[PDB]
Design a protein around this ligand. Structure first.
Ligand code: HEM
Ligand SMILES: C=C1CC[C@H](O)C/C1=C/C=C1\CCC[C@]2(C)[C@@H]([C@H](C)CCCC(C)C)CC[C@@H]12
Length: 402
């Protein structure tokens, strides 16, 4: 034929990356799939190809134990975790903690929460202004997961605002000092709340887990109790919020797919799968450590290195998804790493899908003329190597439905 070559170098975790990371991710899969990142907190490797990410998630040589950084002999002297969360642990501890809490997020248990969710969603849709510009993140995307997780756990939703500040400090790329403060406040708050729970119990998870703790220290230590609370609280809001944000923006930017869902509202399940694929809310999985030398797409990652798996990146891999940049809500897809894979698979996957489906299906039913109240390039993203997430979303809700 006849051709010319275009080069284009994209910012990785600075500048434009926060605005739109996908072109950066797309260059990575094709030319640099296993990439050492000189972050100012030392090297952290990034895997961007689907196959590779998938295999890594079940590769037993890839531990959640930070002591793999330190030489063999120093592993005894040090704690297994910064905080005894199951997401930061390998089996057998992980197994024990996940088994405790498993039943409480069972598929069908979450399914019967759906009417409650739908109520909460409608409650805000009944209460939002018809003409003004509203922030959809803080007034809608935030609320639904926060409120739901709080009612589930037994947290006074009076404190929504309080802990969510500390929560977004831990999730965003904050100074190491800033995060310590937040964890201390979270830990401190949750310790106090659990104490107040010894005096007066409810039906919710914390009450239940508290009893298991007190009655069988080997099943759940006090520290594991608090840390388990920190995790469900945090994974409570800071993930679904961005499924709802990203999922909404996707429809606003793709009038054709918006159209499809308006004519067949039952496409909502299929759509939520596509949103999670198309703009994955958890962009990179939390850090994994090499327990020993590994090799992916022909690149060795030494023993004792940190490793992020590129979730947002991998779900746009052509090798897995035909035409991966097309937003197609009609897809009947399987696999997809947005929720993880293997023994650490998202505990709230079903809950999250329900929140997504209701939050978005209801919003687009109740408000046909919903529109961005700003330019696409005016929207601001949180700087986080863990969530792809909007800070705010100015929109006009427009009139309601007849
Ligand atoms: C759309 C929103 C959500 C996304 C994108 C998401 C993503 C994930 C991913 C990718 C993992 C595995 C991390 C890894 O292997 O490194 C995960 C684990 C987990 N998630 Fe979800 N999640 C979402 C909603 C939730 C909700 C609503 C809960 C409710 C409690 C939740 C609780 C958990 C817990 C406890 C773990 C650790 C599981 C374990 O290690 O056994 N997440 N989340
Ligand atoms: C991990 C390491 C590895 C060890 C580093 O020294 C510090 C570090 C921070 C990460 C954290 C700490 C707090 C809890 C966090 C923020 C997790 C968070 C509570 C989970 C929410 C996302 C998940 C649901 C996918 C994800 C990353 C976790």
């Amino acid at each position: 034929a006849l051709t010319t070559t275009g080069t284009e170098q994209h910012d990785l975790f600075s500048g434009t990356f926060w605005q739109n990371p996908h072109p950066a991710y797309a260059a990575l899969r094709a030319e640099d799939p296993v990439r050492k990142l000189a972050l100012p907190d030392g090297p952290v490797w990034l895997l961007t190809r689907y196959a590779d990410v998938r295999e890594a998630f079940v590769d037993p040589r890839l531990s959640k134990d930070w002591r793999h950084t330190l030489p063999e002999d120093q592993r005894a002297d040090m704690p297994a975790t910064p905080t005894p969360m199951m997401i930061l642990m390998d089996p057998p501890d992980h197994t024990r903690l996940r088994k405790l809490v498993g039943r409480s997020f069972a598929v069908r248990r979450m399914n019967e929460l759906e009417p409650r969710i739908t109520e909460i969603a409608d409650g805000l849709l009944a209460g939002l202004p018809t003409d003004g510009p509203v922030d959809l993140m803080r007034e809608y995307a935030f609320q639904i997961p926060v409120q739901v997780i709080c009612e589930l756990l037994g947290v006074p939703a009076e404190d929504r605002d309080d802990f969510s500040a500390w929560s977004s400090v831990l999730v965003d790329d904050s100074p190491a000092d800033d995060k310590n403060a937040a964890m201390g406040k979270l830990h401190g708050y949750l310790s106090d709340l659990l104490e107040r729970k010894r005096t007066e119990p409810d039906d919710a998870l914390l009450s239940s887990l508290l009893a298991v703790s007190d009655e069988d220290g080997d099943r759940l230590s006090q520290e594991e109790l608090v840390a388990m609370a920190m995790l469900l609280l945090i994974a409570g809001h800071e993930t679904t919020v961005n499924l709802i944000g990203n999922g909404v923006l996707a429809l606003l930017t793709h009038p054709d797919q918006r159209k499809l869902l308006a004519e067949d509202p039952s496409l909502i399940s299929s759509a939520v799968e596509e949103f999670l694929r198309f703009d994955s809310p958890v962009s990179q999985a939390p850090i994994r450590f090499t327990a020993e030398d590994v090799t992916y797409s022909g690149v060795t990652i030494p023993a004792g290195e940190m490793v992020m798996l590129g979730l947002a990146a991998a779900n746009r891999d052509a090798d897995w998804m035909p035409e991966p940049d097309r937003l197609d809500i009609t897809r009947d897809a399987s696999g997809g790493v947005f929720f993880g894979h293997g023994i650490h698979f998202c505990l709230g996957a079903q809950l999250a899908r329900l929140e997504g489906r209701v939050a978005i299906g209801r919003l687009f039913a109740d408000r046909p003329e919903l529109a961005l109240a700003v330019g696409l390039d005016e929207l601001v993203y949180r700087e986080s190597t863990l969530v792809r997430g909007l800070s705010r979303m100015p929109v006009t809700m427009g009139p309601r439905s007849a």
